[PDB]
Design an enzyme around this catalytic site. Structure first.
Site, mmCIF file in Angstrom:
data_model
loop_
_atom_site.group_PDB
_atom_site.id
_atom_site.type_symbol
_atom_site.label_atom_id
_atom_site.label_comp_id
_atom_site.label_asym_id
_atom_site.label_seq_id
_atom_site.Cartn_x
_atom_site.Cartn_y
_atom_site.Cartn_z
ATOM 1 N N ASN A 160 -23.216 2.064 -6.899
ATOM 2 C CA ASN A 160 -23.043 1.509 -8.404
ATOM 3 C C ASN A 160 -23.013 0.034 -8.230
ATOM 4 O O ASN A 160 -23.489 -0.861 -8.940
ATOM 5 C CB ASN A 160 -21.933 2.057 -9.001
ATOM 6 C CG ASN A 160 -22.090 3.515 -9.476
ATOM 7 O OD1 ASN A 160 -22.949 3.925 -9.982
ATOM 8 N ND2 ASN A 160 -20.976 4.201 -9.328
ATOM 9 N N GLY A 191 -27.191 1.692 0.956
ATOM 10 C CA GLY A 191 -26.822 2.460 -0.045
ATOM 11 C C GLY A 191 -27.121 1.794 -1.533
ATOM 12 O O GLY A 191 -27.415 0.607 -1.639
ATOM 13 N N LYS A 246 0.873 -1.231 -0.022
ATOM 14 C CA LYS A 246 -0.011 0.027 -0.196
ATOM 15 C C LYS A 246 0.942 1.233 -0.034
ATOM 16 O O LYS A 246 1.739 1.344 0.646
ATOM 17 C CB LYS A 246 -0.980 -0.056 1.289
ATOM 18 C CG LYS A 246 -1.834 1.259 1.246
ATOM 19 C CD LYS A 246 -2.793 1.453 0.335
ATOM 20 C CE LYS A 246 -3.963 0.347 0.383
ATOM 21 N NZ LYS A 246 -4.878 0.612 -0.791
#
Lengths: 367, 367, 367, 367, 367
Positions: free
Chosen positions: A183, A180, A80
């Site tokens: 998408n 929610g 990361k």
């Protein structure tokens, strides 16, 4: 921070501080484990109050990407990057050209992707300086939408949790509560409606709820009382830190399987869910479809091979439940032990000598 | 000419005189700066009265291509070839085979394109001797029309100048005066008509004006009085040396943004326009779409990536206006300082060592 | 430590924390500048009370190696490794195999050598995992003694300081005070005796002083009163932190030129020496012969080329004195400005594009 | 077993025992002959009562694949892998990663395919470790159905046997008896119906017989009395060991040509068929279309080139009948002698020296 | 033999049966472990009564070479070839050309050397077909005598056993009993005489005993009563199976350290020696100098590097005695546990990803 103690406890391989003065770059690349393959990780840009906050954040996300890449079935490690800056006032070309040269200075040992803070226009300035970046191509730029892949993975994982808790994977006649109408959740509701399941949706915005009710026939529910809705499967898809002491005694459900990150606020809440018999499939195994989609680009992108790999999240959740029933442990512990057993077994089983071995970055025959 | 003085004043890297007797080739290749990348430049064939005229012409165009490639956002330097000859009586295969071997003798340090004098049939004889030539492929030969790209760049730059001078980039209800109904200007009028702006066109030829009035609904105006037409945006697209002492006091406009080369006849006229408050976006930043289109071929040609790069001429003009408001200088000085700051910053920010660095000519992974 | 502030003030490129749990490795590799070439630096193993001590130590030594490699005339950058451990109880094969793989994971961006803590048997376990290590070969293991090279460099630098302070470089008839009769100082006394200079030596051990008096005809002097000996050239060769407030008013000399590291305790003492007219040639320019000797191995080791390069420390000290007389600054500032001007000039003068450029690690024609 | 005696009698090149303890792999790779090219062979997973059964099975199948690849016209040798295990309870990722590294340790000397026991999901774990695996690609995964290829080969071989036994290859008006309505046999019945031949089909399952009668107009016949049906061509497509002493005196046919493996139970039955005048085209020459289809993938898969190669089974059967009439031998001996003469001739005719020779695994020009 | 059981118990990687009919080759190559590096092993030619004797012999010697290469400090695995034949009547060129092609068909996974049965003229026919053979070069053919290396290793191991059993490694004044006056033992007696130790030698042949008494001043002792000679160190150098029930109660010595192979007849005799307090340094650690000498040829042969590596048998025996005192186990168990801990640690410590890793067969920079 006593940073070698924190590295030694979890066996972090490297932490690496990049800096460039004429561009303003301050970056922290953290590589946890590169046993399975190169460390794929996101590049996240966010403003911190100090250096130590960014360091702790990069270390936690490197460990999390290690377990995510291991449990997904990928030949990739965990790392990361955190860039310290403001993504609204402190971006230019020069810091990403400098950062792409610092990635090229690792020689393929770390592969970067986009994350919270960067877009796919900053992974095009980096692509000018390196190959070790994914999410770049016009092929993945056309046919590589991450959200249908993530929703298809949530679909398969919910099938596996349904066959665990019900006996059969058929959802024809089930009540799925989704918060929610983003998408991923919208494509998830499309998959569940084409199967023929009864849906109950909510979101912070009224417009997405109205779109979902007009399209797939659900109930416009307030965002505060989605927890107390009587249902079978609850699919959280908005934020993290959901399951806490305020929210446990409202669940009338028995299966939790959604695309949200960091769903359990603390592991004691996972212990409580394991006591109550609510079948919890773990968070970083269900929503792992997007990382599979951006990792399939390294072969040369092909949609059919990618979706054929995303199909196996069914078997991944099935193995998590098999290990959890085998050792009588909670499932969030079972997913970590699944990933660690895969890392140890692939270290002990790929040990015989070859001087022409293949990895994820090898240049091979076209065919 | 005292040629090292003129090279030393502007830091020209090389001037290079090619000659071949059995083919009749006399060529002058001038490389100004190769800091950002290889020197891309046109190959121009034109008959001069002397050698010194061709030398001055190549030196000026090499400096101009340096600033054009730098301000466009490309990893390319500036150069220019002038072949001394007549393109109607003095072309054969042998001079371009000789010239392609002289380009191959630079080892990718100079990349050539077509320009005034050569066609894409002479950049196929050169392609037999070298890779360092652009505008060659059947892919760019099919889907690589330069004029829609140049008009799309003029479109985006006119949007940026409109948001500078008006507040919003919407041209719905504006009066755009265009001279020349050439191919770039015709596609520009198509873009402006599909947006819904009022157009006033003219050209030397009556047939193109009649075609423009039949297609996009404009006014057939004489070529001598296009300057005195009351409008907002004037878009010169025919020749250079337009803005001089004869033509300044006829402008009723406040924005000049067109695809013409060498629009300001002298920099004092740019100082006068900066005094009068007419928003002048600079010439070699607006019309830079064609060089982007022929430079995207070096990656393997793809129309979507190319047009996504041509879209950024909006942000390029926005940075020119930001520097001009920052230092209180005219915009033709602001574009030069933008390009020079990009060259200096990319020299100081790509300085750390790599033994496997990428450039524009690197052979990399397909993906 | 607020480590990005300390990196941003001096433009450190990277700091890199290596860790390996099954071998016990904790290493800090610090790369300051890789403009001139790859960062060559020593690998130093020493036990610290904390992490921050090791971090500060690695950062200071990385900056020092940058200025040493730049002033020596080498195409090498500056870096430094610190391994945190005890070199008497905490060495094994596994930590150097792990550390050699971490050096190979930088792809030639960092080249390591031996230093205080490691021997040339640990740079043979590293050589099994990488090429980017110097001091390894049987050729350098036979004909590559570092101390005659360092003494030959101290010899040439003392010639240059003698021509600065006296007019002629001839030392035939001069009185050279040397402390320490170590290997570098013993070969230095051999060079000064073969020239025909009068020598006055001392050391902590009586046996080395007795050997020096038997061999080269010097005075057996106590180690506490070598400062008050009336001489021309004082050549400190034992430790650092010598020149402080206790030791300044005892010098009857006017030239200080020795092989000791960190000779000035604080820069105010260098200001005091610059006031008193004592010609101080700087420390990291005189004793730079050993780094040249271990850096010539990268070409394939040859003694004549190496000693021909070590000869130029004469001209290096001459340029330091030229810059010091030019800007009227002390010589320890003049050496830093010499090195920084070399770095800036070699960045601005090697800027033209090549796709086949040579560096220190390039594989080239044998000849 | 006295295994070198059995290898020496038939000139087996290698037998190779792979084992991996942390994955449970026990594999036997047998390579018979690699004169023509690399040994292509299937990977078969099946549980045996002992090791010697698996060893005998691998040796027989290696010899059979040698003659199949030689008679098909392919530049491939003969080999076979047997993995000892249960394909329902004893598969995981680690044994196929270990096995792919053991195939990569042969350096292209052995190429693997799928067979009874493995699927094309296990030849994707192997593909992560090697290139020497066929049946992997999305191109062959889309357009590479093996059964239409095998049926097209059976079609062409039946044409050749019809021109041998009848004079003309036209089957318009013939009676073809087919047992099994599997996929190969169903596409065979489609080809024979589009030609316009009368069909008589049977199968163990009633549903496939009903589908065949509904589609192509045949007779629903019991599976026990298909042998006594009066016909010209019998096309066995179900199992092996068919032609034995129980089944010989029921044939009213004169041509046997089907896709079944190991059709003659013993070679004495082939001698009896050669006495009775029944035209027997041999089994491993007719059904060789699938091996051609999976071997054409090594070039980069293309359907037209593959089917153009499968067309030549007509000429292959024609050469078998030519050799059988030439030496007055049965046709199952004639196919072995055809294959052995091809191996000997291609050894004696490709003997002249080249230092850049091409083979099946060579990387060549795209074109 | 039930050969997969015997492979599974000890984790043998491969057994591989080569056969060639036109040359008469029957070979068994056995690879036990290739974790550390490629499997180096001898090629032994000897006539057996059956196949199973050769198979058992190759399996035992493969395991023994694994522990020998691991304890020596080499990056090499363990394997062994047995060729079944008579080395006096059944050698020709064709079997070694065939066998060299079978070694080249492993791609460097197995490296061969000479052993009992083959000479360095058969490892020159193999060298025509492969690089993976050692003992071939004119450099090792000149300066690579194996017996001084083996004697120098026995010298260093006897020093380590002397410092274990006596306190100091000085043998000046000790009585060393040596059986066999072979080449290794003769150079050992030269080393012990140049140190100044009292020697007592014997051999089957009277001539070698007479040479040893004339050269190094020893006692001509009968071969049957060398066991009862009162001495400190007994150095067996003739055969194996020495220490058995007939020979234990005659030792007046306390240190056994010789160059003989398979010194302990059964491990119970090692348990008896561990009871009696006789310091037994293990057999395959002392005499490992010859394998180091033939393994140093893979770098390009150099005598100084090889002897510097052979010097470390002192530290190897010291680590064996450290582990034996640590776990209170006999020393022949301590050597096996030393080797297994080195294999496990080098698997767990060389696990981080590199795409350009070095091994024993890598082509690297000359320097």
């Amino acid at each position: 921070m006593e940073l070698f103690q924190y590295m030694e406890k979890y066996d972090y391989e490297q932490v690496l501080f990049c800096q460039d003065k004429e561009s303003g770059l301050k970056a922290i690349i953290v590589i946890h484990d590169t046993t399975l393959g190169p460390a794929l990780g996101g590049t996240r840009m966010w403003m911190y109050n100090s250096e130590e906050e960014a360091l702790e954040d990069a270390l936690r996300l490197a460990r999390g990407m290690t377990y995510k890449n291991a449990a997904a079935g990928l030949n990739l490690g965990g790392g990361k990057t955190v860039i310290i800056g403001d993504p609204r006032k402190d971006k230019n070309e020069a810091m990403f050209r400098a950062f792409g040269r610092f990635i090229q200075g690792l020689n393929g040992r770390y592969i970067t992707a986009e994350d919270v803070g960067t877009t796919v226009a900053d992974m095009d300035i980096i692509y000018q300086e390196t190959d070790y970046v994914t999410g770049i191509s016009p092929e993945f730029g056309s046919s590589g939408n991450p959200s249908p892949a993530t929703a298809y993975g949530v679909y398969r994982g919910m099938k596996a949790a349904a066959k665990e808790a019900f006996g059969s994977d058929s959802l024809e006649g089930k009540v799925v509560a989704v918060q929610g109408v983003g998408n991923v959740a919208y494509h998830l509701c499309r998959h569940l409606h084409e199967e023929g399941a009864k849906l109950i949706v909510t979101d912070i915005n009224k417009e997405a709820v109205a779109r979902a009710v007009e399209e797939f026939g659900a109930k416009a529910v307030d965002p505060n009382d989605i927890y107390g809705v009587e249902c079978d499967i609850f699919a959280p898809c908005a934020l993290g830190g959901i399951i806490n002491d305020q929210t446990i005694p409202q669940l009338k459900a028995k299966v939790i399987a959604g695309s949200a990150n960091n769903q359990l606020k603390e592991p004691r809440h996972g212990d409580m869910i394991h006591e109550m018999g609510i079948v919890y499939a773990p968070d970083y195994v269900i929503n792992a479809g997007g990382v599979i989609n951006v990792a399939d680009e390294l072969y040369g992108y092909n949609r059919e091979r990618a979706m054929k790999k995303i199909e196996q999240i069914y078997d991944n959740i099935e193995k998590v439940f098999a290990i959890a029933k085998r050792d009588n442990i909670p499932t969030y512990v079972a997913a970590d032990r699944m990933a660690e057993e895969r890392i140890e077994t692939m270290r002990k089983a790929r040990s015989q000598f070859l001087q022409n071995g293949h990895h994820i970055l090898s240049r091979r025959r076209a065919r």
